[PDB]
Amino acid sequence: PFQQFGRDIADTTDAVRDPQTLEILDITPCSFGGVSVITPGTNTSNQVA
């Protein structure tokens, strides 16, 4: 019922509450992954995956 702020282990906000209304909100960084260029050598080809 107190402040509109929340925290986690990594000190990055996860759950908050709106200022104007009183609805609870969950914050989560959107789709994040990692590219991994699967490639042969430059001279044999340039197409990658």
Q: Which residue ranges make up the site for ligand NAG (CB under 6 A)? A: 20-21, 40-41, 43-44
* Residue nearer to ligand NAG on the CB measure, 12 or 44: 44
For residue 16, list its beta bridge partners: 25
Residue with tokens 């986690």: 8
| CA trace torsion 18, 24, 27, 30 (10° rounding) | -100
- Under 8 Å between Cβ of 25 and 19: no
* Residue nearer to ligand NAG on the CB measure, 7 or 25: 25
* Residue nearer to ligand NAG on the CB measure, 13 or 40: 40
Q: How far is the CB of 5 from ligand NAG (least distance, A)?
A: 19
